[PDB]
Structures are given as structure tokens and as C-alpha cells.
């Protein structure tokens, strides 16, 4: 047959069946088969087997009818009820049209901007195991575009990430962290702003991560912190961070942590407290007090890491500094 947007009318209708009460025979199962076929039908409008995608009767009639039908929401709002390969296809569709530009405009980013709840449904997807990893894929594509990144970041619902990176399920919690890393690092200016303004409650929350029972959570959070402080755009956030004695004391204890990989990451944070020209009063108080015990520490610290140039140059820089007050 091959229709253009009777496919959109079909999907919409079948999903409606799949979301009503009982009927667990004949019709439930026949609706599930229909959603499958049409997500495929739809998926090949945009990609299209051994014949180019028609930059006309394909994308626009499909993109147009996706917006007017609100099918894009219905698929995220009901992602649950769809089958395995189904959720894989939904997410690939969602990603494709969200990437769609006509001109210098990305129409889907504009649509979502007015259908903001789609972003919030995706994010909230982390709390439902059967769909968490699919919502991560889709959410993370949204994040690629600054408007939407902004929507999630500035929402109060962003601090849900400090629960999500902490789940029970390792796969999911790891994916939560991926998104949460993507938010804070991709749109540099956006995230520099957010961090400057929300500093106090952000870092109060970030500090709980550095104390995690979960090894991955701790190691990765700590690794990220170092990336954030050392960034050029985050100059101001950095200065505030390295002025607080409670902060130095944590890093220095993390230098002496059970895990040598965590000690290593602690090093790249600790590194900047010392390289800092404009130190503050209790900064010096701890350094000079712990001088020499540090110069002794640094020399005999991760020497087995000689496949690494910079590291060994930074160590000789740090001892030079802790012997120069």
C-alpha cells in the first residue's frame, strides 16, 4: 500500500487500544502487532530502505502530522505499553525528527518548546525500569539543543538527578549519570550560568555524591568535579570552591582513600587549591600546617604511573609549591 500519514492515524489509534482496561485476547494482541508494523513503516519514511528519503512527501507530511496529532507525546507518555523493538524504533524516530532542520530552524525544538511536558515525561522515565534506558537515549538527544537543555537544567526537577544517579539498578543509574554529565558540560555558557547562580544548593548536593557507597558513583562524580573546576568558563565557580577549608580537607582525605583510582581523581581537584595565586586564610593554614607531611606524601604518591607525562610534571610542580610559602 504505502500511505503518508495514515501511518500516523494508525499509530495514534492503536496506542489508544493499548491503553484501555482489559481485552487481553485477540484485540490486545492484534493492537500490539499494529503498533509494531507502523513504527517500522514510519521508521522507513525517515531512513528508507535502498531508496533515498524523499525530502518532501516523506519528512514534512510526516513531521507535520506528528506535531498536529501529538503522536510524539503519546509515544513518550505510553512508551511503557509498546514492545522491545518498538521502544527502540520510537526512540530512533524521535531522535531523527528532533535533528530535522529546515533552513536554520529546527522545527521539533520549537514544537517541544511549546510541549515542554514531553521533556519532563522523558526525565521522569528514569523511575520506570522497563523504559529508563530508552528515555535516556531520547532525553539525551533533546539535551543536544540548548533551549531544551536550558528547560531541564533550570527546572527544579533537575535535582532529581541526585537520586537517579543513585538507584539500585546499575545500568540505569549509570545512564542517569550520563545525561546529568551531558547537561552540565555541553552548553558551556548555559551551565556556567546555572552553576554560578545555584552554587550553594548544587554543591551541597554534589558533595553527597563524593561520599557514595557506590564506587562508580563516587569515582565518576569526583572525576567530573575536577573537569568542572578546571574548565575555563567556570572560573568564578572554581574560585569559590577552592576558598573553603571544608573542601580542601575532603580532597586531602580522598588522596588517602582505599581506592587508588579515586585518590588519582582527588589529585586533580587538590591540584588547583595549590596552583591558586589568590589563596585564602585557612587555605594556607592547612597547607603550611600540613607542609612537609605533604611534600613527603607527594613524592611517594602513585609513582607506578610513568606511562603518564603530565602527572609526573604536576607532582614536581606541587612539591615545589608546598615548599614555597
Amino acid at each position: 500500500m504505502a500511505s503518508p500519514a495514515d501511518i500516523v492515524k494508525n499509530l495514534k489509534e492503536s496506542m489508544a487500544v493499548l491503553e484501555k482496561q482489559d481485552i487481553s485476547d485477540k484485540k490486545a494482541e492484534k493492537a500490539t502487532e499494529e503498533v509494531s508494523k507502523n513504527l517500522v513503516a514510519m521508521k522507513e519514511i525517515l531512513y528508507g530502505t535502498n531508496e533515498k528519503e524523499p525530502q518532501t512527501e516523506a519528512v514534512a507530511q510526516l513531521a507535520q502530522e506528528l506535531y498536529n496529532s501529538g503522536l510524539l507525546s503519546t509515544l513518550v507518555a505510553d512508551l511503557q505499553l509498546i514492545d522491545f523493538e518498538g521502544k527502540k524504533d520510537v526512540a530512533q524516530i524521535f531522535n531523527n525528527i528532533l535533528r530535522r532542520q529546515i533552513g536554520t530552524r529546527t522545527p521539533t525544538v520549537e514544537y517541544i518548546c511549546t510541549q515542554q511536558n514531553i521533556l519532563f515525561m522523558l526525565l521522569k522515565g528514569y523511575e520506570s525500569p522497563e523504559i529508563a534506558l530508552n528515555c535516556g537515549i531520547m532525553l539525551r538527544e533533546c539535551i543536544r539543543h540548548e533551549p531544551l537543555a536550558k528547560i531541564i537544567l533550570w527546572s527544579e526537577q533537575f535535582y532529581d538527578f541526585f537520586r537517579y544517579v543513585e538507584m539500585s539498578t546499575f545500568d540505569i543509574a549509570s545512564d542517569a549519570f550520563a545525561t546529568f554529565k551531558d547537561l552540565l558540560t555541553r552548553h558551556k555558557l548555559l551551565s556556567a550560568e546555572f552553576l554560578e547562580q545555584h552554587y550553594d544548593r548544587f554543591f551541597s548536593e554534589y558533595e553527597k555524591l563524593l561520599h557514595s557507597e557506590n564506587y562508580v558513583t563516587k569515582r565518576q562524580s569526583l572525576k567530573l568535579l575536577g573537569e568542572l573546576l578546571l574548565d575555563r568558563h567556570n572560573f568564578t565557580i572554581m574560585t569559590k570552591y577552592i576558598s573553603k577549608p571544608e573542601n580542601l580537607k575532603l580532597m586531602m582525605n580522598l588522596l588517602r582513600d582505599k581506592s587508588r583510582n579515586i585518590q588519582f581523581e582527588a589529585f586533580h581537584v587538590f591540584k588547583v587549591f595549590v596552583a591558586n595565586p589568590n589563596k585564602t586564610q585557612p587555605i594556607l593554614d592547612i597547607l603550611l600546617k600540613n607542609q612537609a607531611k605533604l611534600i613527603e606524601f607527594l613524592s611517594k604518591f602513585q609513582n607506578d604511573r610513568t606511562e603518564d607525562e603530565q602527572f609526573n610534571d604536576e607532582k614536581t610542580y606541587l612539591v615545589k609549591q608546598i615548599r614555597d610559602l
Partner: peptide, 5 residues
């Protein structure tokens, strides 16, 4: 261990 303090 460190001097804290």
C-alpha cells in the same frame, strides 16, 4: 595522618 586540626 593529616593535621585536622
Amino acid at each position: 595522618d593529616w593535621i585536622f586540626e
